[PDB]
Curated annotation (Swiss-Prot), chains A, B, C, D, E, F:
Glycosites: K43, K49, K65
Site feature: Not glycated: K7, K13, K17, K27, K36, K39, K66, K71
Organism in which the protein naturally occurs: Homo sapiens (Human)
Residues modified as Phosphoserine: S1, S20, S48, S52
Domain remark in the UniProt entry: The tau/MAP repeat binds to tubulin. Type I isoforms contain 3 repeats while type II isoforms contain 4 repeats.
The protein, known as: Microtubule-associated protein tau
Organism domain of life: Eukaryota
Sites of N6,N6-dimethyllysine modification: K7
Stretch of the intact protein here: 622 to 696 of 758
Role this protein plays: Promotes microtubule assembly and stability, and might be involved in the establishment and maintenance of neuronal polarity. The C-terminus binds axonal microtubules while the N-terminus binds neural plasma membrane components, suggesting that tau functions as a linker protein between both. Axonal polarity is predetermined by TAU/MAPT localization (in the neuronal cell) in the domain of the cell body defined by the centrosome. The short isoforms allow plasticity of the cytoskeleton whereas the longer isoforms may preferentially play a role in its stabilization.
Subcellular location: Cytoplasm, Cytosol; Cell membrane; Cytoplasm, Cytoskeleton; Cell projection, Axon
Tau/MAP repeat placement: 2-32, 33-64
Residue positions where N6-acetyllysine is found in the record: K7, K13, K17, K27, K39, K43, K65
């Protein structure tokens, strides 16, 4: 005579919250710029930014993962 | 005389929240710019931005993953 | 005698939320720009932006995934 | 000069919900019964039930009512 | 020089919810019974139940009532 | 010179919720009974119940009422 009962429960939260979240930015200022760079030789790629304001978020991460591997047996 | 009862439950939440979320941006300012670069030799690509405001959200991430697996076996 | 009962339940949520979400932006300003670049040699492509405001989202990510494997076996 | 405008609006709900409503009943059981009553005198009626399961509703009530009286009068 | 404007509004809800409402009854059990009552003298009615399960909802109530009344009078 | 304006608003809820509401009953048990009552004399009505489970609701009440009595006059 045997009885077996298997009823596991998952109620968990796995969560990520990444970047610029929930800020208040009120009346931000800015400013003025020049470039006169001259005769220049670049052997490879040039990357440049000449903003007044930069307001930025960059999120390579935050990739949650869950794994769940259940088993039972008799004989 | 055997009984086996198998009723596992997933009620979990797996969640990502990524970037510029829920911010308040009240009256952002700006500004003014010049470039005069001259006689130049770029042997490979130029990437350039000359914005007044830049407001940006880049998200290569946030990619959730769930694996779930179940088994039962008699003899 | 044998009895086997198999009723696994998935009621979970898997979710992503990526980019510029739910922000409030009130009266954003801007500005003015010049370029005079001269005699230039570009041996490969120029990628350039000369906007006043740029407001941007770019989501290569946020890509959810699920796997759910089930089995039962007698003899 | 006179002006009179009369536009009363009834958009209310009056509702009753009475008895065995919206229940979920999964696998109810039952059982076994005997009576041997003997030499009996009943000078008035026997009302009797010998069921195994009885599942029952009886609603002498739930009877809604409304009254809505309107009037206007000049001189 | 007179103006009278009469536009009363009823948007209310009046509601009764009475009995066995929204219950979940999972696997109710039962049982077994005998009566042998003998040489009896019932001078007025016998009312009897000999069930295994009895599940019941009697609702003489829940009877809503709305009265609404309106008047206007000039001279 | 006169103006009169009459626009009362009812957005209320009057509500009753009476009996066995929203329970979960999971695997209820039961049991076993005898009556052998003998030679009995009843001068008036006999009421008897010999259940194993009794699960019951009885609601004489819950009968909501609303009353609303509006008036206006000039001279």
């Amino acid at each position: 005579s045997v009885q077996i009962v298997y009823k596991p429960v998952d109620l968990s939260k796995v969560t990520s919250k990444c970047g610029s979240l929930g800020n208040i930015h009120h009346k931000p200022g800015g400013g003025q710029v020049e470039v006169k760079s001259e005769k220049l030789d670049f052997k490879d790629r040039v990357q440049s930014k000449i903003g007044s304001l930069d307001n930025i978020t960059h999120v390579p991460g935050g990739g949650n993962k869950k794994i769940e591997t259940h088993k039972l047996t008799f004989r």
